[PDB]
Amino acid sequence: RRVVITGMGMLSPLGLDVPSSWEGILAGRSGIAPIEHMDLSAYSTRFGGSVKGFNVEEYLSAKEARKLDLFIQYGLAASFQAVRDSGLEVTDANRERIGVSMGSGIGGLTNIENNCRSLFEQGPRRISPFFVPGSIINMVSGFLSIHLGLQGPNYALTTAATTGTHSIGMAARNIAYGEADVMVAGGSEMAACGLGLGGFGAARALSTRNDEPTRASRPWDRDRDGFVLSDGSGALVLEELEHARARGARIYAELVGFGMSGDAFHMTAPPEDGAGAARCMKNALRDAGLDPRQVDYINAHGTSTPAGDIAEIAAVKSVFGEHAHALSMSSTKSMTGHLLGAAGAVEAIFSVLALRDQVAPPTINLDNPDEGCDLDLVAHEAKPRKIDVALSNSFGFGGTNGTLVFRRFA
């Protein structure tokens, strides 16, 4: 059973929908700025990718919204955009065949931090009654199903940077194997609180380029110093092909492959050859029935880390051989930063749009490619080119790897 993309939705540091975000991507625009919503003078990193000007009231009543952490509000916004974009009418004849898989890396950290402050100052009577339902990761899937009447498979992944990739891949598996005809899948993140910036800062994971936030995210650049923490959400409507065809749906692209692997190497550090990423990409290509030479575009994991970026080049060279010099690969995290559990979702949308528009997004900030970083990394400016097959990679903490493969639809 074939799986197509019929609807997409997004909040990112570049825009409050897909068209606005993609316009930013193609123009080489950074969404990274000093963070406004808290005082970070004690933190080593004081900048990130925030969602600008979000109005939850476009999606939910002020009543419903006050009960939900920002990561849920973001996930719901993306989901509602995707469902609307799909044109699907939910009925009694199909509602059991429509499910949801929206994940998060960290979930309701802001809500946890604020409730923790009330707990320590006052005691447990100050904890919100909506604290649990409004903070737990599966409540994007939960609330979406309730609002739209979706009675199909209902779950949530939490796999760090791989969350959105795994969410989409496993949703596509549900449709492929007949457990559902439609799935809303992707991920959401809002970890820009004291615990998030302080936590990743304590692990020395973040860029500390406070003087030039728009230059901080620089995948494959010799002066990269860690990732940029970013917020938002991505959602796709995945649909069985015959189901989509029958209702006259607009098909953006086909989801042809999903691969997974584990490094089984280290908690935060990748193998220097990227062997786990290599296995993952090969698993996805095998799943899609594609040779490496059929790949035209890779949306890289490319988080702007010393070890991670070079390991991904190594894995691409291993998988693609001489064809590694013919494909284009870029990291849109150059512009968006690292959306953690949303990264795979937004990057899947950017991969589908590279197929729609026949354009490889840039890697901005790639001033001085490091040793070995000699592929077409689409430095600086978008590249019009032929793109039949687009791959999206995500490699998360714990060495958990996921690859999606999208194809132009015939």
Ligand X SMILES: CC(C)C[C@H](O)C(=O)NCC1(CNC(=O)c2cc[nH]n2)CCC1
Q: According to the binding rule CB under 6 A, does residue 130 interact with ligand X?
A: no
Nearer to ligand X, 182 or 339 (CB): 339
Residue nearest ligand X by beta-carbon distance: 308
Count, residues in the chain = 410
Choose which of 267, 322, 384, 386 interacts with Cl ion (CB under 5 A): 267
CB of 408 to Cl ion, least distance (A): 40
Exposed/middle/buried for residue 36 (C-beta within 10 Å: 0-12, 13-18, 19+) = exposed
- Using CB under 6 A, which of 33, 195, 205, 241 touches ligand X? 205
Q: Considering only 17-25, 148-156, 302-310, 327-335, which stretch makes contact with ligand X by CB under 6 A?
A: 302-310
The kind and range of the H/E element at 98 are: strand 98-103
Output 66 or 266, the one with its CB closest to Cl ion. Answer: 266
Rounded to whole angstroms, what are the CA distances from 154 to 99, 226, 297?
A: 6, 35, 32
Beta bridge partners, 383, equal: 360
**Nearest CB to ligand X, comparing residues 111 and 261:** 261
| Min dist. Cβ of residue 267 to Cl ion (A) | 4
Identify which of residues 84 and 266 has a Cβ nearer to Cl ion in the complex: 266
187 vs 75: CA distance, rounded Å: 6
For ligand X, the binding residues in 218-277 under the rule CB under 6 A are 268-270, 274, 276-277
| Axis-axis angle for helices 343-357, 18-26 (nearest 10) | 70
Mark the segment that binds Cl ion (CB under 5 A) among 16-24, 258-266, 301-309, 318-326.
Answer: 258-266
Tell me the Cα Rg of the chain.
Answer: 20
Closest CA to 172 of 99, 245, 233, 255: 255
Q: Sheet harboring 328-330: ordered strands across?
A: 154-155, 98-103, 182-189, 232-240, 3-11, 253-262, 400-407, 389-396, 297-299, 328-330
Which secondary structure element, helix H or strand E, spans residue 34, and what is its range? Answer: strand 32-34
- Structure tokens given for 285: 């290509």
CB of residue 337 vs ligand X: minimum separation in angstroms? 14
Question: Could you give the CA distance from residue 126 to residue 118 in angstroms, rounded to a whole number?
Answer: 6
Question: Minimum distance from CB of 201 to ligand X (Å)?
Answer: 11
| Binding track, positions 305-344, relative to ligand X; x by CB under 6 A | xxxx--xx--x-----------------------------
Q: What is the dihedral of CA 333, 336, 340, 344, to 10 degrees?
A: -70
Question: Is 260 in a helix, a strand, or coil?
Answer: strand
**Does residue 266 interact with Cl ion by CB under 5 A?**
yes
Which amino acid does the sequence have at 377? L
Site size for Cl ion, by CB under 5 A? 2
Tell me the site size for ligand X, rule CB under 6 A: 20
Amino acid at 104: S
Phi, then psi, of 103 in degrees rounded to 5: -115, 175
276 binds, among ligand X, Cl ion, none (CB under 5 to 8 A by kind): ligand X
CB of 162 to Cl ion, least distance (A): 17
For ligand X, give the closer residue by CB, 80 or 395: 395
10 binds, among Cl ion, ligand X, none (CB under 5 to 8 A by kind): none
Interacting residues with ligand X between 372 and 401 (CB under 6 A):
395, 397, 399
Q: Residue numbers of the site for ligand X (CB under 6 A)? A: 203-205, 268-270, 274, 276-277, 301, 305-308, 311-312, 315, 395, 397, 399
Q: Residue numbers of the site for Cl ion (CB under 5 A)? A: 266-267
